[PDB]
Design a protein around this ligand. Structure first.
Ligand SMILES: Cc1ncc(C[n+]2csc(CCO)c2C)c(N)n1
Ligand SMILES: Cc1ncc(C[n+]2csc(CCO)c2C)c(N)n1
Lengths: 254, 243
């Protein structure tokens, strides 16, 4: 047996700062995935420091259409998806510029999901160390596609170990796996609202600290209770313990 | 035994469909003018009033809602004043555990009972774009609506419609001519372990639909003009609307 002072009774929690990638400074290691939605202005800052940048289908069009005059400074490592979704001249441009154009036929999975699978393969091949995968898009447009985006977060647990967030306009979503989470919301990029959405199944035991309306061993479920328009207590930290995957959503300032 | 329904019927220029119109806090789509014209009763939920007011400048008197409900901190002062002045019924719904959309449906059900109105469906405009938490709240309102009113409720914005299918069998007529190319079945809430359909390109046969298991998106029609769905738990139907 060991002797002397020994640590006891600790447990593991998943710490994460959702909006860290939006900060000017820092040394966060992350990849960037551009989906088929109009690009927000923040894509410029995020593009610079990303370790790997990719586009899924039509995302290449949106990237191309917002980078005229400086497209050589915005060349994705790769572009994957259905190639009928990319305009002819756009595909021609990225191809000649050396971008890896990867076809992903599979009619049972979205280009987003297929794009993550390709990204994971590249992360491994290049032995990259990634703290998060930042996805731009997916939360606007066709309602079925917004839902597909959410479902991709559920499938991702089987695609990659790296945390994945999705950001579009003023919103971010991130899927909290069963367990305890420590979310730092003190970057100063945070907006005023947040929420906890029990999308796949009711979360029968949710406990939080840091919210205006906290949950204490409470049930969150559609038709029972869903936390929307929640806000922070000002502590700069939100903790969440959930028994099933629970979708965290939060506002992005401005 | 089965619930027959035609989701896009209200979008048709033709028809004698009795429906109420609810305007949520989002910019209005081109289909607004026509929907307002033939609605039996129109209402605004909070900010919805701001969008209406701004959109109808110059002809506001032709677009006066029966009532406007919600937390008054969501409606601009001048907007609230205007509708009040024109005789619009302004109802305060301050409860912070419920959204203005849900509270608006409660007022609407009261009004329908009060006036003994015969309503086939409640058409909601907005709620599917913007803040992600609010899009999910819109979905949750549909779960709650089942205990608020017996009148079917659909939500429409841009090119999408959502409609919640209660446990049981449904017959959805998708031959109005207003249908877009895609549709889906989203098991928001809980997995639906026994789903059976006809009319889709990818049908389900006593199959499981659940997030992380199988979610039907980008599904399409078989061209028969009819989609039937049997489900064990509430299942969200979503469909494209022709641009
Ligand atoms: C667990 C829980 N999360 C969030 C809210 C807040 N909320 C819910 S609906 C609404 C009004 C929207 O206009 C507000 C503020 C709550 N009460 N309980
Ligand atoms: C039950 C079921 N519903 C829909 C589809 C169709 N689908 C799903 S993802 C995708 C491509 C999206 O870009 C398509 C066409 C399916 N295969 N199975």
């Amino acid at each position: 047996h060991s002797s002397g002072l020994v640590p006891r009774g600790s447990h593991m929690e998943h710490a994460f700062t959702p909006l860290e990638p939006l900060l000017p400074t820092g040394n966060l290691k992350y990849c960037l995935v551009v989906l088929n939605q109009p690009l927000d202005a923040r894509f410029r800052h995020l593009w610079k420091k990303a370790l790997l940048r990719a586009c899924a289908d039509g995302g290449a069009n949106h990237l191309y259409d917002l980078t005229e005059g400086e497209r050589e400074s915005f060349l994705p490592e790769f572009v994957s998806g259905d190639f009928d979704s990319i305009r002819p001249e756009v595909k021609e441009y990225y191809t000649k510029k050396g971008c890896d154009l990867i076809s992903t036929p599979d009619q049972d999975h979205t280009d987003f999901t297929k794009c993550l699978q390709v990204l994971q393969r590249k992360i491994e091949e290049k032995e990259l160390q990634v703290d998060v995968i930042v996805t731009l898009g997916g939360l606007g447009g066709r309602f079925d596609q917004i839902m597909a985006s959410v479902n991709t977060l559920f499938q991702a647990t089987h695609i990659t170990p790296v945390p994945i967030i999705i950001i579009q306009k003023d919103s971010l979503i991130y899927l909290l796996q069963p367990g305890k989470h420590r979310l730092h919301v003190d970057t100063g990029m945070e907006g005023s609202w947040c929420g906890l959405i029990p999308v796949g199944q009711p979360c029968n035991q949710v406990t939080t600290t840091g919210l205006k309306w906290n949950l204490t061993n409470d049930v969150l479920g559609f038709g029972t209770l869903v936390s929307t328009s929640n806000t922070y207590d000002g502590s700069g930290l939100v903790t969440v313990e959930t028994d099933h995957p629970l979708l965290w959503t939060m506002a992005i300032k401005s």
